[PDB]
Amino acid sequence: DELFDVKNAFYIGSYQQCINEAQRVKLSSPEREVERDVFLYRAYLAQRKYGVVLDEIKPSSAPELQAVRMFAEYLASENQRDSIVLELDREMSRSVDVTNTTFLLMAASIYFHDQNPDAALRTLHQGDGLECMAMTIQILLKLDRLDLARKELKKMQDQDEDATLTQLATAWVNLAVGGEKLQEAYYIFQELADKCSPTLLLLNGQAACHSAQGRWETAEGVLQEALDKDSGHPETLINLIVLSQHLGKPPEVTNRYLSQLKDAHRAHPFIKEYQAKENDFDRLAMQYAPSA
Template sequence: MPHEDREPDELFEIRTNFYTGNYQQTINEATKLKVPQNLQTEKDLFMYRSYIAQKKYGVVLDDIRPSTSQEELVAVRLLAEFMASESKRDNILHDLDSKMGGNVKNSFCLLVTAYMYYLSENYETTLKVLHNADSLECCALTIQALLKMDRLDLAKKELKRMTDIDEDSVLTQLATAWINIAIGSEKLQEAYYIFQELSDKHTVTPLLLNGQAVCYMAQGKYEDAQTALQEALDRDSNDPQTLINLIANELDRLVRNYQPSVSS
C-alpha cells in the first residue's frame, strides 16, 4: 500500500527495535527520545514491555504506582505482576474474566489481556478477546494463537488483513515468516530470508536468530541451527526460547540420526 501521505512515525525506531527483540535498545531510545505529549504513553509502554521481556518486572512495578488510573499503564503493570508471580496468575486471570464482559475497548488493554491468556495456553479465549481488535499487534497475536491451534487456514486470512493494513510493517513480515514455517517445504527458505533481511536491515537479535534456527531445524540442518542458536545464546544467555530450541534441536538431531546397533 502506498505510504507517501503518511506523517513521519516518531516511534518507528522504538517500535522496530521492540518487534525484532532488541529490548535494551528499545529502552535506551525510549529513555532519551523526546516526543509530543500524545505519544508519551505509547513510548513508555514499549519501554515497560521491554523491561518485562528482560524479566525486570520490579522496574515496572516500582515505576507504575498501583493507584494509577491510566488504563494502558494499569494493563502493563498487571502484565508485570502476571509474569513476576506464577502463584498469582490464576487469580489475575479470574479477575480478568469478570472484567471482560465486553467492557474493554482499548486496543492495548485487549492486547495485554489476550497475551496473558495466550501465555496460559488458553488460545480460544485469546481469540475471543481479540475478536474485535484491529491493531497490527492484535492481528499478529491472533495469528500466533491460530497457529498454536493448527488453524493455518484462518491464520492466512488474518495475515491478509495485516497485509491490507500495512504490508511493509515489521510485524507483517514476521507474521509472514511464522506462516511460511507452518506451511513448510519451500516456504521454509522464504521464512529464513525474512529473518535474515530483518537482521541485515535492523540488527541481529536472539528473536531473529531463533526464527532462522527453527527454519534450519525444519529442514534437518541441525549444525546450522546449532550455530544460529549459539549466537543467540552468546547475545542473551538467559533467553528461554533459545534454551528450548537448543534442546529441541539436539533431540531432533538424535532422533533423525539414530541407527539401532546390530549385534554381531
C-alpha cells in the same frame, strides 16, 4: 510514526535497544507519551524485570500502563494469577471499552498464558490494531489452524505488507506451512537481522528455518552466536539440544545443554514437560512391568 523505532526494536527482540530509544524519544503528546511508556515497560517485561514495572507503574498511571502492570503481576506472582484472571474476566465482561488497544493486548496475553485461547482470541477480535492481528495469527498457529491464520495474515498483509510486524507474521505462518515456504521464512528472518541487528529472537528464528530443512550444520553458526551472547537463553539451549543430536555430538553434550537450561530457568515449560514425560514413563513402566 515517531515511536516507529522504539516499537520496531521491541518486536524484533532487541529490548534494551527499545528501552534506550524509548528514553531518548521526546513525548510531543500526552498520547505518544503514554504509548512510549507502554513500550518501555513492555520491554522491561521481555527482560523479565517485573519488579521494575510493578514498582514504577502506580495507580495514578494511565490505564494503558495499568494494563501492562496487570500483565506484569500476572507474570510475577503465580499465586495472584487466578485472582487476576477473575478480575480480568469481570472487567472484560463488565465494561465495553474496545478503544484501549493496549488493554486488549495485555488482557489477551493473560488469557494466552492462562491457556484460554478462546478468551484471548475473543478479546483480540475486538481490537483493531495491526499488532492485534499479529497476535491473533500467532494464537491461531498454536491452535494449529493454519488456514485461519492465513486469512488473518492476508488481512494484515493488505493493510501493511512492509511492516515488520507483518513480515514476522508471514514468517510464522510460513514456518508452519512447511515445504518451500521454509526458505521464505528464513530470508525474512535473515533480512531483519541484517537490517536491524541479529537478536536472540531473530537468530533462533533463522536456526529454526534451517533446522526445519535438513541443514543442521548451517544452523550451528546462528545458535553458536546466540549462545555466546546469552547462555541460559531458553530457545537457544533447546535448539542446541536438538541440533547436537543431529550433528552426532556426544550424548553428554545434549545432556549438558539440558542441564544448563534447568539452571537458567527451573520453571521453563520445556523443563516441566520433560519432567512430565519422565513421570508418565515411570508410570508406564509399572504398567508393562511384570508383577512380583
